Swiss-Prot record, chains A, B:
Function, in words: Serine/threonine-protein kinase component of macronutrients metabolism. Forms a functional kinase and phosphatase pair with PPM1K, serving as a metabolic regulatory node that coordinates branched-chain amino acids (BCAAs) with glucose and lipid metabolism via two distinct phosphoprotein targets: mitochondrial BCKDHA subunit of the branched-chain alpha-ketoacid dehydrogenase (BCKDH) complex and cytosolic ACLY, a lipogenic enzyme of Krebs cycle.
Similarity remark: Belongs to the PDK/BCKDK protein kinase family.
Protein name, entry field: Branched-chain alpha-ketoacid dehydrogenase kinase
Residues given in the record as K(+) binding sites: 256, 258, 261, 267
Modified residues (N6-acetyllysine): 120, 161
Compartments (UniProt record): Mitochondrion matrix; Mitochondrion
Species of provenance: Rattus norvegicus
Binding site for ATP: 207, 243, 262-263, 267, 270
Listed GO MF terms: [3-methyl-2-oxobutanoate dehydrogenase (acetyl-transferring)] kinase activity; ATP binding; protein kinase activity; protein serine kinase activity; protein serine/threonine kinase activity; protein serine/threonine phosphatase activity; pyruvate dehydrogenase (acetyl-transferring) kinase activity
Biological process annotations from GO: branched-chain amino acid catabolic process; isoleucine catabolic process; L-leucine catabolic process; lipid biosynthetic process; regulation of acetyl-CoA biosynthetic process from pyruvate; regulation of glucose metabolic process; spermatogenesis; valine catabolic process
Amino acid sequence: TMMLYSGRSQDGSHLLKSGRYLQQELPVRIAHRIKGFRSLPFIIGCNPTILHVHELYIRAFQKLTDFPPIKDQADEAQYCQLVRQLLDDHKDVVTLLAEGLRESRKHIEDEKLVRYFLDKTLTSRLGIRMLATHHLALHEDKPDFVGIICTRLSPKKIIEKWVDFARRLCEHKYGNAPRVRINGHVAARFPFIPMPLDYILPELLKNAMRATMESHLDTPYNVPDVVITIANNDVDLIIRISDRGGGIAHKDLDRVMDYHFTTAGFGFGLPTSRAYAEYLGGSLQLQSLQGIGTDVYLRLRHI
Amino acid sequence: TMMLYSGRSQDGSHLLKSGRYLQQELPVRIAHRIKGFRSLPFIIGCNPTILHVHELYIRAFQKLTDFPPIKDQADEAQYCQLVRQLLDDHKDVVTLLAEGLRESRKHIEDEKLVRYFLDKTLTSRLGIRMLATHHLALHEDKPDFVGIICTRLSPKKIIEKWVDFARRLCEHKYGNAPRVRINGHVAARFPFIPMPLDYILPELLKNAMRATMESHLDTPYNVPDVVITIANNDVDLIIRISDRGGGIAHKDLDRVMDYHFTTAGFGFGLPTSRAYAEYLGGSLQLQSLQGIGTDVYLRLRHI
Ligand SMILES: Nc1ncnc2c1ncn2[C@@H]1O[C@H](COP(=O)(O)OP(=O)(O)O)[C@@H](O)[C@H]1O
Ligand SMILES: Nc1ncnc2c1ncn2[C@@H]1O[C@H](COP(=O)(O)OP(=O)(O)O)[C@@H](O)[C@H]1O
Ligand SMILES: O=C(O)[C@H](Cl)Cc1ccccc1
Ligand SMILES: O=C(O)[C@H](Cl)Cc1ccccc1
Ligand SMILES: [K+]
Ligand SMILES: [K+]
Ligand SMILES: [Mg+2]
Ligand SMILES: [Mg+2]
């Protein structure tokens, strides 16, 4: 449904076609988000933070539609400025929704409703930001990238990037962090879009590390490694993240995938990651060994 | 629904109550199996091997109902002889059903039907044999057993028993076998009924070993270990069997749980194991890392 244009061209004609495609596509997608807010239960839609986000989307739609049809490179250039502005203006939207919904959702009893709204809203948003960021990136001169598409992504490398990140957060909080071993198809390289991994990987790694530290309070200086296995085949990329952090309790298991649920970010890591994975044609599955640890399986389809 | 009597008594009164319970229970359960055969699609029910099994059940029902009410230890003793006879007469039933159904099932188009019949038939049969074997075992003087209930089963020990068994089959066929490492709650001991593990474990181990050998045809002398993790908590026992045997292909994944499906026993290992696990209140789940290996998770509820 959403096209990431991979074409390049000397005169910069492909930038024009891309820009014109965005211009047709973005207002429509934003209008769908606005309809989602309009259909929220009244009591939730009246929450001042939800109203703020609703108004941001209306404002986005207005600016996008106010922008004249792109006729030349000069126009396309100014359109990119608008798109950059909107991307920035909306950067905290996930956090505002989480906040606005936290209490308000407790009112209504159809708890399916908020899950559906958040799944639909956050995944459409991911898709919108991918499209827009892709267009902007077409102007960049990065080797191994066409827009936001890496032509030879290494799962091992991007995993290591987020491992370093998560380990530093963990070390800050607990004074130590599990080491991470990576095995399986460590030398794999293939065309792939980093952005979803950039959201999902740190969420899963933070979870695994927290769980490991909290279950080893007596030996923070000596905790079990987290073990990550990469499997690359013609159909999908599988990343298994296995910890010895004690598992997800039976009493918690049916709730960990709910937005807002946490035993402690703000309980969004798992449901958001799963929503993103499925949006892109993959999945996120959990296997809990209560008393031992948890295996988390991220699957993403190849391009 | 099915009670395994754990009571013991000096005068041998508990043997009488147990026997009388069997006498009430067995004919009813067998009649249900007979109704299952009666409702099989005509073309399948007419298969001579299916008819043979159908007739065995009728004959079982006749003998059980022909047996007079148990009034004393002398009677109970003779009833045990009948039960032993029937257990033996029916020992090859799974194999006969597999054979009788193999071709005949291809006729009818509702493929849900055979799955349902086999799930229902095989699990009811497991339950019946557990009840009967339990009663017979009440006469035995084994330490750590009440009937077929082990009062302090070690998952590690019973796993090692079947590991040795599977490794010998594997070595016979391929000239070598993966080593198996066991980790997690290796010292766990708890009350538990071995019989279902005795069916399931060798099936899962044979699968893992076959997969490992067939994916390492160039280095049969040096193959990846199978790794088994035990997790014991207050709710269930989890046994994870992880291999590096290349995984279950995407094109096969939705078929491996079908009776008769095999890429090579006779394609019964997985569906039978899952049926047994669920019958007992647990589950059997597969995680395939195509190109790398497979994790199989057996969960069984504590007693
Ligand atoms: N690897 C894991 N081991 C144990 N528990 C986990 C793991 N991953 C997630 N959880 C549980 O799931 C809950 C929800 O996780 P998440 O949605 O990422 O939100 P948060 O981390 O903000 O609590 C966590 O609070 C934790 O209880
Ligand atoms: N651990 C495993 N690794 C790879 N493939 C497996 C594994 N376990 C089962 N399979 C696949 O599932 C199929 C069905 O298995 P099963 O029901 O046990 O029957 P059988 O072993 O008789 O073929 C196997 O033929 C094999 O292709
Ligand atoms: O992040 C958001 O919530 C929106 Cl989709 C940002 C946006 C980007 C491009 C055009 C319009 C809105
Ligand atoms: O294995 C079988 O198919 C039956 Cl349940 C054997 C049996 C055992 C006890 C009483 C009747 C039948
Ligand atoms: K959550
Ligand atoms: K099968
Ligand atoms: Mg989290
Ligand atoms: Mg098998």
